[PDB]
Ligand binder design. Structure first.
Ligand code: ZN
Length: 27
């Protein structure tokens, strides 16, 4: 899989978790 977040300096596991991370913290 695929999922770097650009708001908090990161790399990742599930998709749904990145969506719930930005859609729960950033916007
Ligand atoms: Zn973040």
């Amino acid at each position: 899989k695929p999922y770097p977040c650009g708001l908090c300096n990161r790399c990742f596991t599930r998709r749904d978790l990145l969506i719930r991370h930005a859609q729960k913290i950033h916007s």
